[PDB]
Design an enzyme around this catalytic site. Structure first.
Site, PDB file in Angstrom:
ATOM      1  CG  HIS A   8      -1.248   8.484   1.816  1.00  0.00           C
ATOM      2  ND1 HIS A   8      -2.040   6.804   1.529  1.00  0.00           N
ATOM      3  CD2 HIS A   8      -0.742   8.713   3.132  1.00  0.00           C
ATOM      4  CE1 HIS A   8      -1.671   6.746   3.303  1.00  0.00           C
ATOM      5  NE2 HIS A   8      -1.288   7.848   3.774  1.00  0.00           N
TER       6      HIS A   8
ATOM      7  CD  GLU B 186      -4.219   9.446   2.951  1.00  0.00           C
ATOM      8  OE1 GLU B 186      -3.458   9.141   3.592  1.00  0.00           O
ATOM      9  OE2 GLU B 186      -4.651   7.978   2.169  1.00  0.00           O
TER      10      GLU B 186
ATOM     11  CG  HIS C 285      -1.323  -1.228   0.956  1.00  0.00           C
ATOM     12  ND1 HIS C 285      -1.775  -2.388   1.752  1.00  0.00           N
ATOM     13  CD2 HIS C 285      -2.685  -1.550   0.237  1.00  0.00           C
ATOM     14  CE1 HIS C 285      -2.813  -3.117   1.754  1.00  0.00           C
ATOM     15  NE2 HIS C 285      -3.395  -2.990   0.786  1.00  0.00           N
TER      16      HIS C 285
END
Ligand SMILES: Cc1c(C)c2c(c(C)c1O)CC[C@](C)(COc1ccc(C[C@H]3SC(=O)NC3=O)cc1)O2
Ligand SMILES: [Zn+2]
Length: 258
Positions: free
Chosen positions: A94, A104, A62
């Site tokens: 991310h 995010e 991930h």
């Protein structure tokens, strides 16, 4: 058929396995800078990373996690909106397929190229696994990345990524100093939220720094060469591993600054 960031298993699907995805305190959110309330009672953040002990870097399919020794109070977050002591366990990022997306949290609907999460757990719950079951179990320090000048303190991370290209690969990653990832200012927004990946538990006090860090285009391009897949599986570039903004519902974002 497990969760991920694709058309068939991405964020819009997560509620089927994790119904709390539609809960009352989900993350991330859009930070509307004009509606955030300056709270003069908010204390300065205390970031004590001088004794941080990094151990390992892991591609978990991930993101990549830089893991710390959290068996003692070595790297702790205190103050700001927090009651007590939160111990650093890991950080990760991310990021996007393009410089125009990847974060995010958003700021007035602006997406940054990436977002760093430093994850800490409340020591009064003894272990990370117990902390995530508590509404005040975690504190996540979020830092936006914009593309411009290189971040010298990020390069050691960038340079080990070739050794953890695929899911389940890890590498020794000792003596990494996370102070080299912080911006100058510790001005922040804060709100109660959640993990931004399954299991989406509502256990996080979010502390999002106002000041982004700059990274170079070459640094973020190396993030985008990572793979979601395992070794010997079809190559799926690890890009766009961000959950989009979720409804704020009955929450107020507080600012530490005017
Ligand atoms: C039953 C059970 C559960 C559900 C459990 C844990 C244990 C020990 C359990 O026994 C611990 C981790 C975990 C599997 C999930 O903990 C996570 C914490 C952080 C993250 C990273 C998220 S939160 C963030 O800021 N950005 C992310 O990507 C993922 C999973 O939850
Ligand atoms: Zn995260």
């Amino acid at each position: 058929h497990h969760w991920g960031y694709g058309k068939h298993n991405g964020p819009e699907h997560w509620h089927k396995d994790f119904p709390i995805a539609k809960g009352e305190r989900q993350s991330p959110v859009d930070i509307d800078t004009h509606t955030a309330k300056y709270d003069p009672s908010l204390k300065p953040l205390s970031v004590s990373y001088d004794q941080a002990t990094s151990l390992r870097i892991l591609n978990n399919g991930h993101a990549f996690n830089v893991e710390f020794d959290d068996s003692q109070d070595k790297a702790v977050l205190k103050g700001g909106p927090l009651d007590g002591t939160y111990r650093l366990i890991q950080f990760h990022f991310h990021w996007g397929s393009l410089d125009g997306q990847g974060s995010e949290h958003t700021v007035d609907k602006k997406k940054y190229a990436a977002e760093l999460h430093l994850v800490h757990w409340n020591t009064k719950y003894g272990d990370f696994g117990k902390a995530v079951q508590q509404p005040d179990g975690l504190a996540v320090l979020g830092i936006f990345l914009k593309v411009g000048s290189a971040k010298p303190g990020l390069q050691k991370v960038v340079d080990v990524l070739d050794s953890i290209k695929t899911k389940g690969k890890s590498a020794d990653f000792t003596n990494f100093d996370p102070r080299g990832l912080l911006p100058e200012s510790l001005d922040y927004w804060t709100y109660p939220g959640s993990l931004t990946t399954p299991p989406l538990l509502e256990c996080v006090t979010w502390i999002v720094l106002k000041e982004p860090i700059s990274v170079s285009s070459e640094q973020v391009l190396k993030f985008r060469k990572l793979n979601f897949n395992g070794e010997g599986e079809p190559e799926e570039l690890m890009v766009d591993n961000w959950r989009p903004a979720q409804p704020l519902k009955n929450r107020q974002i507080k600012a530490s600054f005017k």
